Design a protein around this nucleic acid. Sequence first.
RNA 1: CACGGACCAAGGAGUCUAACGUCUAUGCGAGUGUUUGGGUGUAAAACCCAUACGCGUAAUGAAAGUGAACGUAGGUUGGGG
RNA 2: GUCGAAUUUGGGUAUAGGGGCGAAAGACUAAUCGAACCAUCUAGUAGCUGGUUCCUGCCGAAGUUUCCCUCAGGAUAGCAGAAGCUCGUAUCAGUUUUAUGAGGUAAAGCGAAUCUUUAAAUAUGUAAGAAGUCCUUGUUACUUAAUUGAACGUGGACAUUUGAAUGAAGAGCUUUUAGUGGGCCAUUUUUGGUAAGC
RNA 3: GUGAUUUCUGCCCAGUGCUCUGAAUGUCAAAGUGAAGAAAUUCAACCAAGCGCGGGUAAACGGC
RNA 4: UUGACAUUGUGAAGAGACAUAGAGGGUACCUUUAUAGUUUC
RNA 5: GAAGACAUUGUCAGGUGGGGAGUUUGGACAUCUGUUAAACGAUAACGCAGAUGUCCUAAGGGGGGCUCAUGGAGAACAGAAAUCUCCAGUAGAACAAAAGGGUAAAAGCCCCCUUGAUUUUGAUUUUCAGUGUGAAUACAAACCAUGAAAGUGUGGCCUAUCGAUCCUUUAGUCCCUCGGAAUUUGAGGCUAGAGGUGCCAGAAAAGUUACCACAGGGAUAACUGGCUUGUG
Lengths: 50, 94, 97, 93, 55
Amino acid sequence: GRVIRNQRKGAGSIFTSHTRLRQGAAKLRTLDYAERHGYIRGIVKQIVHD
Amino acid sequence: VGMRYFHKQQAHFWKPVLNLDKLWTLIPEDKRDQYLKSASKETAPVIDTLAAGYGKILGKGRIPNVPVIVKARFVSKLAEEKIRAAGGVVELIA
Amino acid sequence: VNVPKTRKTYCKGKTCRKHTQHKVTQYKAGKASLFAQGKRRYDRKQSGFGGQTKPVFHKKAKTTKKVVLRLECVKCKTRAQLTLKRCKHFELGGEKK
Amino acid sequence: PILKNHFRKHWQERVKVHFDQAGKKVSRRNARATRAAKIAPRPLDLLRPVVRAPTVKYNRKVRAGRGFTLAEVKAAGLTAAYARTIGIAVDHR
Amino acid sequence: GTGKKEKSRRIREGRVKGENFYRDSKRVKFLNMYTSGKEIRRAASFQDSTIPDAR
RNA sequence: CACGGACCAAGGAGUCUAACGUCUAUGCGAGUGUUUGGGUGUAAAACCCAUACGCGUAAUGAAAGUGAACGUAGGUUGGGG
RNA sequence: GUCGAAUUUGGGUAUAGGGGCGAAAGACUAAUCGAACCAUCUAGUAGCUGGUUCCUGCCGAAGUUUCCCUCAGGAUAGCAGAAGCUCGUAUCAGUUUUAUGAGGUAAAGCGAAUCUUUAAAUAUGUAAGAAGUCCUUGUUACUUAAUUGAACGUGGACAUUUGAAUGAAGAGCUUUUAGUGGGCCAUUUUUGGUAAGC
RNA sequence: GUGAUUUCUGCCCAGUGCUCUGAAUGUCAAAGUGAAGAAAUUCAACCAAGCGCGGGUAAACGGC
RNA sequence: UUGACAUUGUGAAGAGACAUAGAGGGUACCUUUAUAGUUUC
RNA sequence: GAAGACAUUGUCAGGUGGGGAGUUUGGACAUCUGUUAAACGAUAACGCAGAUGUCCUAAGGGGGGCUCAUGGAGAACAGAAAUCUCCAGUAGAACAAAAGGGUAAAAGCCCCCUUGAUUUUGAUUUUCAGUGUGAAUACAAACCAUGAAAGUGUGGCCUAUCGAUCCUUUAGUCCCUCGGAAUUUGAGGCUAGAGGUGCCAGAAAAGUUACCACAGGGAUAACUGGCUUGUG
């Protein structure tokens, strides 16, 4: 027969994630020297819908 | 049917026969009559069958009374026996 | 059926050429011997792609085999084969009727 | 009778017919005249030895070989390298 | 693959066309009775159209 | 009341080849086949030719092998002339 | 039918043939989809259908045998033509007559048995001579007690009434190949069937 | 897979398909190991997964 | 998906066998021992 | 930072593998007796009533003896119902089995000896192309069995009981070949059997399509030959 539905997902033709409105990738801070041997102080500026 | 024979080449099997019927065609015509008018063991006409292109001498018909020297690679039993009736020998050339 | 262990039949071994005493045996097929001609041609042909190449016989209908009965002489030891008809129960020697 | 013809292949592509048999012969004799003017005093072919043929069927005959030897050229009294310029074939093997 | 063959299954357990790992050997003659009555151009089964001998 | 045909002109279907069988014509005949090739030329024609080679003159064997007159190449029977 | 939203639509862009895409009909993918279109392999294969082009002369069939995964077809035999060859009255014949065989059907019979005691008509086998008969004795490793016999002969004897009738555009022999291998009807016999253009 | 809501979903792990914290010497390839032989070669012992055996599972196919 | 071979090295322990290195020791033998070695799990 | 002589990657090997690829998915067939079958033979139908894919070292051979099925008249037990005995008994019994033949000093029943159910290859009969397979009959050369002897015996009293090519395997010879020349293993040959194709003159093989495709075939009912009506 023809190719069933779940075999056709992995091509990524029309199934790619909708990503126009996303703010950015939600990651922690990159582990530098100051975060590995002390602390650093940061300000939260706005909390926002993604 | 039989056994198989790998790499056959018809140069190991070249051996054309020659009946004692012919046996005088190898001598040319103008020399043919002279040795028939001689029963001499002194002068027997030498026949070299290998130069004519004949492997084996076979005895089929009967030859005249004249003694003949025959040179060949192979002769048979009745072919060699019939020449000794005429008083001729067979020299096995190779 | 029931055949005797001893049987006096004609021999041929360049000396006997007469009715001499024999001993009975039953024929059994030999070992397959994979270095024969047919096995080596069959093994080279199955090697590779293509799957099965020779026919493989399926439809069996017979229920018996022919009794093949070879007889060993006791003087010259020349063996000679001899056959019977198709039969189902084949014992030999004992149980005289 | 059974007769074996080997024509299942696409044989009509590879058919060569020799209409140039009388054409190439005329174009070959013009080579043996053009060479005979370039090689102008010289006899157009080297000198060939005398050789007895192999293979029991044919050993009764004698045949023109390829070249003489390093030995037959020495016994005639000349070197091998001077022999090829005079016009004499030399086979080393 | 090598195990799920007709020749290699019957050796594990210990002839009509269509015997499988499924139904049985006897079900194949049974379930072919739904297509049994046909005449092939051999007349159809249970209609022989012949006169027997009634003694 | 099975299929094709409205009418006219022009096209339109047992062909060529390789290996053969029976038969017939011609050449030579224990031989035969010049044309792969060479020589020659009025130039793809014609004419000439060497050594080979193919088939034939011996068969039978799976083979190693062996290999055809007792005799007017025989006796009997029927035979054209 | 629905008409503020799972709405409608322009442009841009993404997915391409055993692949796409599908709120799922095997739908749609340039009037083509239970597998697009283009060119090549390709003049693919057909045991099936249709067609096959001038005239006269002579001869002239088959639907049947056995085998085949054979039943719309092949191979084989039969029937047919052509080429002729050896010879020339000749061996003969879809026929009768004389002689002698084999049959078990209709009838007859159950005071025959339980399915034949008897036995036609029509059909059928073989003879009607020269490759014969007769006489005599030659050969042999067979045969006999034995040259006894068998078989083949040497030699001798018997002509066209030489062994019934009628007839005989010759008789014998050999190659070689075509088409056919779907049949059907009537008298008489008979099966199966109530009977049937069965 | 099923198809809002209200309401209700009983029994069977034999087959079939899964599954495993199970079992252990039943079958069991190549490679390697041992023996015989002049050698090619042959017979042996050993042998992973799977299979086989044992356990689980039915809002898994199902049989109700 | 599972096994073997290759990629693929080096250590310290352990369990063996040999090569070597002396002593003893009833062409040898063989219980012993040292070391500097080559390898087997 | 993590991990480390393991993973990864390469090559072979087993397990799984309609997710995918290619293809297939037969049309009283081999036989023997009776009858249909119409006085040689041959002769059909999805005619017909029945048998076979076996069985037996004797149920094969040879020789000697003997008479069966059945009835009548009788013998403590014992009767219709064992054994005994006589009279009649053309077979009314029996022979491995279907069926048709044939069989009485036997082809049956009992005893005596045995392996001819052997070796070598031809001729012939049946189906038939007068090919094969099967089965059968009569001889010749051996070597045997048996019988006092003639004779008989090449399986079963006659008609049914079965199998090519390639491959595997044994027996025969102790032979032939391994092609540079020998030895020893190994392999291939000539001769004669076996292992089997029951679709039995011999392919290795599951379904569905109403989504269907193609090349072709075949329809049309209602006049049999007085064919149909009211009386089982």
